[PDB]
Amino acid sequence: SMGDTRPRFLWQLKFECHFFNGTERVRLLERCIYNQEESVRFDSDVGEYRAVTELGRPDAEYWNSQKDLLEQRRAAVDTYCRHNYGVGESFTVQRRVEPKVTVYPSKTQPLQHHNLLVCSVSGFYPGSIEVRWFRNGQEEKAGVVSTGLIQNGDWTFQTLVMLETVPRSGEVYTCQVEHPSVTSPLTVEWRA
Amino acid sequence: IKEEHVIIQAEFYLNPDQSGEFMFDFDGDEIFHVDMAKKETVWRLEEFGRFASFEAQGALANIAVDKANLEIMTKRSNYTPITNVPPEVTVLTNSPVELREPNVLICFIDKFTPPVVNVTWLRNGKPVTTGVSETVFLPREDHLFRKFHYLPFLPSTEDVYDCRVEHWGLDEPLLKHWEFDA
């Protein structure tokens, strides 16, 4: 309907399982959020609920009076976090998708003036990657800028890593990508 | 230390809209959500449904608890409503654009609350309604939300696009422009 400006009221519940070194160390953080303010949380390093704001104090007190809820939450690092890690490991933790790497100049400008060379690294997973530029085999760092890591929302990432150059005839520029999906670096050259 | 991972079960209930959500996230990507109308698990990548299962009925019972808890909290706060936080919007493509080679326009809407937004793609000023898909509201550590909308398309240097976003926090529709240059 048009003209709907009624006040809104929001409640969020978040259960976060944090994993360190496979599942050797696991921490559960259960968070309640009213509007934009977290009001109460269960942290498995504490083992009981704690008020984050005064609004949450009644719930921390009430939930901490419940033996069953507390015992269930104290065991949840195993029954929930480690369980779900095991369910999803093979297609999440172990997911590997190789990027497609392309190089192109940013605009058509004459040699011996400034240009930006673009190394596009598309479609990879997980997000840890190293993208570096070389000129005639020597690394270039001062003139490098990037989009940063872009999450596409579809379990792939992309990034552009750009090099400001003054290209001279005969020079070879290389973009080199290292990523857990490949056993040797990917390299793409552009010849001035 | 990208040797850490995080799985989040994130849920919400919003009044007076009567809108719920239930999703799991792994390292910032959605594993699945429960469609609240069809009452079913929707895997973010279809093949995940060949590798794992989930029981949506239990998730839907949690949403009944979340609605009751929202009603309690709304009263307990003396009916304090949410402060709107408007989105920021970025348009990008799945991959570098080449003339007439199929691609996807991505409208990424970020840093907003409450989780209600109207998103329309415009081509040459006119709404493009079908072919689009969209994600549910994805959680952020600051308890705002983000969201992706996707439009498969054929790049042309003559077309222009806008992702038009309406939200209570905005004074006027936000129009994020995109076009392919020669």
Binding site: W63, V87 | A52
Partner: peptide, 14 residues
Amino acid sequence: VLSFELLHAPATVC
């Protein structure tokens, strides 16, 4: 296949 499990939400205090 294996099943992801959820944590159930407790009722806040009236």
